[PDB]
Design a protein around this nucleic acid. Sequence first.
DNA 1: TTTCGTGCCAATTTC
DNA 2: ATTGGCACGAAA
Lengths: 1327, 542, 49, 79
Amino acid sequence: VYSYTEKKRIRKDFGKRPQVLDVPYLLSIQLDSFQKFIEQDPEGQYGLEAAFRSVFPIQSYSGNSELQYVSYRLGEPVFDVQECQIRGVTYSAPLRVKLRLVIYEREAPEGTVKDIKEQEVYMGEIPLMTDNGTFVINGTERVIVSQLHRSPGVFFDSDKGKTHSSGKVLYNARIIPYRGSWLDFEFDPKDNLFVRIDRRRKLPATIILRALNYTTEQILDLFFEKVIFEIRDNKLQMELVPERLRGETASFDIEANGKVYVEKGRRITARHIRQLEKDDVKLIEVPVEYIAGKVVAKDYIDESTGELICAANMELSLDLLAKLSQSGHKRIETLFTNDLDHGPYISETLRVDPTNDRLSALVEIYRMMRPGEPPTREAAESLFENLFFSEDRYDLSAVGRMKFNRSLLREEIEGSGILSKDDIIDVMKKLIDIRNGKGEVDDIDHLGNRRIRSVGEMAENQFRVGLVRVERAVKERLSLGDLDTLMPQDMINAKPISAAVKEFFGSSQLSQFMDQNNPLSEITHKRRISALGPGGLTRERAGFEVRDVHPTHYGRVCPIETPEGPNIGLINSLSVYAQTNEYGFLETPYRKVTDGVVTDEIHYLSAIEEGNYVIAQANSNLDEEGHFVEDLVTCRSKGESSLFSRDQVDYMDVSTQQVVSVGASLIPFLEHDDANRALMGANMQRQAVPTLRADKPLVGTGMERAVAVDSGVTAVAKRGGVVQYVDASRIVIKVNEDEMYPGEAGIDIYNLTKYTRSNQNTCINQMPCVSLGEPVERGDVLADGPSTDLGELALGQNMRVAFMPWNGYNFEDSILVSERVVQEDRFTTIHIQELACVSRDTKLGPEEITADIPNVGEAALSKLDESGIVYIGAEVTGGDILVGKVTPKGETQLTPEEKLLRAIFGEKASDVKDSSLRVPNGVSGTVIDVQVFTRDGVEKDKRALEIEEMQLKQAKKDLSEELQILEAGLFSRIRAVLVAGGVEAEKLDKLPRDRQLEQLAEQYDELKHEFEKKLEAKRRKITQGDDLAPGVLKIVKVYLAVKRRIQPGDKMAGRHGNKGVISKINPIEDMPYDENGTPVDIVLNPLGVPSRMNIGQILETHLGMAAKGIGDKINAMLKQQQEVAKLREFIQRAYDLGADVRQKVDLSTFSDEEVMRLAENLRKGMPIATPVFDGAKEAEIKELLKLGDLPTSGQIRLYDGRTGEQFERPVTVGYMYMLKLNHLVDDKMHARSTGSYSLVTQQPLGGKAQFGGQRFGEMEVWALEAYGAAYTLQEMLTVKSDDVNGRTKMYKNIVDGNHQMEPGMPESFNVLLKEIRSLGINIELED
Amino acid sequence: DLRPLVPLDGGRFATSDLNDLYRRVINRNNRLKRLLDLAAPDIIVRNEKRMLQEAVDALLDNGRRGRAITGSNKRPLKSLADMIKGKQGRFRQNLLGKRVDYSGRSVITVGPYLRLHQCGLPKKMALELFKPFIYGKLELRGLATTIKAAKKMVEREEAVVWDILDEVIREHPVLLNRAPTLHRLGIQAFEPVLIEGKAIQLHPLVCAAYNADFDGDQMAVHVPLTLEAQLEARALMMSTNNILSPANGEPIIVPSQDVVLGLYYMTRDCVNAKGEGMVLTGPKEAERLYRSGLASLHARVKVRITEYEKDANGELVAKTSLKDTTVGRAILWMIVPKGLPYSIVNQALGKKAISKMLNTCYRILGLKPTVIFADQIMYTGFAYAARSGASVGIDDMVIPEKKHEIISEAEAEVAEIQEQFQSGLVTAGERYNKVIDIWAAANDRVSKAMMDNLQTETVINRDGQEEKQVSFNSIYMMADSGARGSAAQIRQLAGMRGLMAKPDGSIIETPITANFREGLNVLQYFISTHGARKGLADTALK
Amino acid sequence: ERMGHIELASPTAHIWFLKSLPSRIGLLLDMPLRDIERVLYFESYVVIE
Amino acid sequence: VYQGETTQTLQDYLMWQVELTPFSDTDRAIATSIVDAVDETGYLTVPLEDILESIGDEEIDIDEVEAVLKRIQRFDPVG
DNA sequence: TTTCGTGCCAATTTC
DNA sequence: ATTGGCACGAAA
Ligand SMILES: [Mg+2]
């Protein structure tokens, strides 16, 4: 089953593994995020609802009134996307929010509702996302890039001995909220716990506990297990737990039941512990020195004296033991602090801790956060409460709470957004457990610890940022009591919200101009992940480990698509099948393997879930029922891969291309390329410029259609039907009767984009690919965009290539190109440039755009129309006038000289200047479009009226088509009734069409009225004036189109990392040729293959040769008229070739017309698909070569075009897919002799556009110093630079034929002297 | 004039940072003067004095004390110290380096026809770069009587200004520079040749000094103006003066790639080639036979060779003898100067042999014969590399027939050691080390088998016997000559890729047992990406 | 090349000779930098005689 | 930071043409005086007697000033 | 009291 | 980030 678009030209697929999951829609990451932001959520988890509920209700300090949020709504945009791009405005919708103000009474319990007033208010404009995932901010498309940031929660890390000279690991924990302040707990080389707040001065870790209303006994009970000493009238008879003595040496004699298990000088072993457990040894006799180090837990007070004998957390001595013995105490509580497992850290911290109450801790915290001011109990309490326990300043979001609970091994997922005492205590306990040796630190580069934040979430955050300022303004203005007269509309102002939204969507770090070289550039830009941006990393502070490939990237982040340079590893690309959780974690699909057979149910697993299973590889053999045939299956288990049994497999990969991205899946024979060259080719593939004619790859992977259709460059049928009208600029489809809505003329009108300018000054142009009367279905391609051929991506051209050295012209990546390639315009591109002329208002009257310029000649005004604007189609060069403008300079004073001048030459010439728009030097092209924008209230000129009539004609034509269809239907209804009533049909056929019946006449009148209203509305929109700027009267934009041809110095590339520069254009009779006299197009150097190890280009060349041979056979069969049976037999042989491939093409179901159309499309070579890691084998390539009567080795004998002598060895000749990159030597060449200089430094400016000079930096100065070229260096430093007098002396000397200089002093040194003197330092030259 | 105001469209005369700081200082000073005049209370004048102190501190050095004051867009204002210091300060931006006049830049292509002292300069660039010289030359010969006449003539680009330009650029060096200039060989002087197009043509032999390749590199060109600068360019910076490395004294004009491949191909012998065994009068007869298709470039023949040696006083004395050589070696002998022995070419010439030949020529004869010899070597290498027709195909990467058995035996040994581990005889780390050693031995065996199969071929003798000679495989020829490729890369092409390491550094125990001719699967490719990106990141960050 | 001047109403310390780590004023007067800053920014007094 | 760009005015163009014309020192001083007294519309704003006075040398007559003015009037633009 | 350990702060990072 | 120098506090 093939669609109409695919049935015209079927691409032969060499894939062998059946598809179980279809490639998803490639732009879901943008559309889903923005829809979550915009759609109204009844519960309010995401979007504008959450932002509104997180601020409202807003109440005054006195509590007399509050503002309550009800609902919100988005209005219809004034203009659509195309109108916004034409005018240069934002595509946005107005936000109307229903607020409600309530008034409460006094001298009543709680608040009595005196009055409630509800009204909707205008909150500003929200930019809208288009159908292709972009934003039109100022007439230009923009993309907001998703961000890979650190997830909220608690993370445990360490330093691997790098901080300390002794190489001791110091563990730490950090709590990071979504909104709030960080909380750090860290260890010391002395093993003391410390707490840090907001990355500020270190504090002991017991300060926070004391501020949380904890006493010393409670802290010791929390962090230690009590040991009970009972004074059984004989030397402190002891109860012993056998497990306590593990890895311990007895410093005394341990005996039980009259038997000495452990003697003096003997340690305790595991067998001894087992014996003690078996015998249930409890009673133990210990000496008085066994307490010489034991630390008391609680406080003991003598009953009689009533004084405090000792404080908590202090080791006891002999005197203290005697005092407690004589005081009649029979219970002692101690802490078990063995140095092996239960290290004494909290006790040491308490020893370090000076504070012993709750207020001193608050004072210390207040002084740490806000030093240099007196402490107050109320202020300190408020600060501590607001730090971590205020829902308005601290938020541990749902993902943050989930991660917190998962790290603490809790059960519940839901929870509160603020910290509590239990959370901090558990974090401390887990850190101490990690210190003791039971626990692991977290891997921060693990993709389970990193989150994806998209455009909707960032927009919500910025909206809340504006909304809190709005709340502050409301609370400031709500103190005044005037509740009987004010209204919510005048109470709130939308300026902060609109400003925040504008600054997010226009000048953010992750908001960028869309890359529009080709559809692949746009797809890659919209699927891009960045670690930079606000709240991310810095490319200087990043490091090596964050830039590395992690195992968890498998199936989620492409490992071979990242820029090379400072941003390597920081900008990533999404994989083909990757998704995100509801928490923003990347996940990938897998097939579930049950009872040893691979099923077809798909589960999306994240990085945390993935590592708990054994997942089989994609390149794993199966059977007719789905059983592994290899006894040792290669699988990934715990971030590592190894061989596993057939019954230990849990999941399997869905595809062999789920690990690469969209750009890397378009490289054929990727598995034969080195990874560095694969990265280079993936980067180079998305900077190719579209040419005049599109050429399908002829060797592909099968992903071209997905890229072409999921991009918005093509015209895709919304409904099925028949092509009623087809034209170079519009398509009209007559929709089928079963897809039409009631009471509707069913037609779809598609207006094609014709020769418009992209963000890269290239051409965007759509061409129809359907014919008149042919059937179409939903989803079919109607028109091809740039770099698209019949619905497939086509980035380059197919070139006949030979790999051999040719006289040094392909030395070091150089490329030798034939003259026929230039003659056939195969790499010719169109570039469009825009120029603007702005007419403003001055004090001496306004500037006038006109053709009556006095000072210029009659020839220079030949290209201007009556309105002073250049004609459409005019060929212009540098210096020509495009828009004629004059600036007033009139003044009342008139000397006799001015009177004579005006009398002789006329008054128009005087009191006016010439500020016309001219073509910049070195610029040429053809005027293809002129746009005029006029301020409202200003008289329109003739050109603007002509443009308006042009715009009105198209809308009139569309409305006329719809009205014509509707009136034809209505008259068909009228005629049937008229005949049924009984009339003569001939009189109806003779009379004109003016002609129950009254009801249909009323319907006719209503239809006419409705279409007149539509036309009037469209005319009113078209004739609407512009709002340009303060003081701007008129704007005129001119578009120039030029064609660039291929030439030496232009950069060419393939898809396998092979790039080069054209060195020579070789005439046709100089190129190598084969036995039939066919020359090659391009000669490439073979020496570039073995060192780079990009073997995929040789295989691609051989397969392209085979495909072109099949196409040659088809073309030869077409030229001599052959019966359709022969053609379909040969094409069936071609499609059936392969080794158990998954594609079945049956031409018996094809009609003769369809077969002939396919054969006509296949006469330039049969396209072939080789999926990545599932491509063709060399045996299949050789079979296809044998089918087309070509040498199996892929090498033929060539002859020298200059001598006719055969080369001594066979040469690899075939077809490659070449790309023209946007690095044109036309933009690179620049020279300067003299020009303009800076005002301050008096040095030449920089840049080709400024006609600037080349910088002679410090390294060049060092190179000249190492040569000894003192005069060349002094000439560089003064005469070619900021030395003003020598500059003019040298020019005069050179013109006179005297090559000598007088150096002088540079100006920048004088500037430096003045700047140093401005600092109050006396610096001067002496002698 | 050192702190100017910025005029923009619409009449907005915006102020700079220094003017703002000066305005703040002046406002505070005026308010303080008025307050001191009016005898204000001390509590107010103290605050005003503190604010004046802060304003002066912000003017002199903004941000050194306290918090830096910001402008309209939340960015701190630039003070005098910020102008003095830093990478964007006066010293490093305007005094230690600066932009200059009479300079241009563009993309570089290759000129294989050029001599070592010549460059290819576009004439559109040269017309702009040499404009005052053209004005002077136009006025000197009466074509233009004033400066505006010459200016208009050059603007119109008349047919005579091109003759004037070719006259004025005749012997006038230009300096070519490629960034970064890591050493003094990054700037060199060349004599221009006016060419059509927009790209600069660079001599191949100087590409190593610049560290340049023809895939997008750009170069800048500067014009010396005074006589001293021109003579310094000719006598110090000229390419023909820079043939030894100042760092270590090694040569820097080493031929590479296509030249090495061509010279290696022509100076090789085949066992049974066309025209073998005939006796020739000299190299000219050898070339005459080769061009006629009567003898092969590799046929082993006897040639009468005359060689000159420098006497004790220093005179060249000639000795003539019959030598056993090949046709290609005799043909190449016509390029060597007269002071060298014939044994320097009677061998297969790799990269090292060609460098040795150049060094011997420089040591025995001097500088001018050496540069002439280098140009002739480059020309001959290019010509015969073109004539050879050397290509690369899929059949060149020959997989050894014994690789599968080696892999199976290694897998069996690994299974045996794993079973021994599961039996409790061995520990974990020692088993890991044993597995690593097993795979290393297997990789070494595969590499040895691949190289043994690749490096030899079988040929038919004159009688009809079988001999073994050095292989004419294209990949083997490229690797053996030193033109391109090493043993490790050929091993990756035709043998197993071997063991891979994690980003931390630990070796993954199971290796990639596939080469690039039969591609890797998904897991092996993902494993290789680790080392690929580690190397790329190190290169980017060092 | 022509400079102007401003007559300050009250003396002001140069920040280069105060905030550079080997403080010239602090070393010359043999006083800590904190006390000098406190006096300069009108936060404490210092006895002159 | 902002610095700006130098612009070439009518007087700058006239002085550039004066520098590249074979004048003597006295003729060059007279030409500098003449170019100084030229307004934006290209007309001489002072009589030749004022220029002769501004020269400051008493051995120069009005004929030399007239000849230098005639030479300058043929610069670009003519007139 | 004098000497040594320890925290704070400034300056550096391509073209 | 890293490194070096200066203040501050604690050791014998
Ligand atoms: Mg390069």
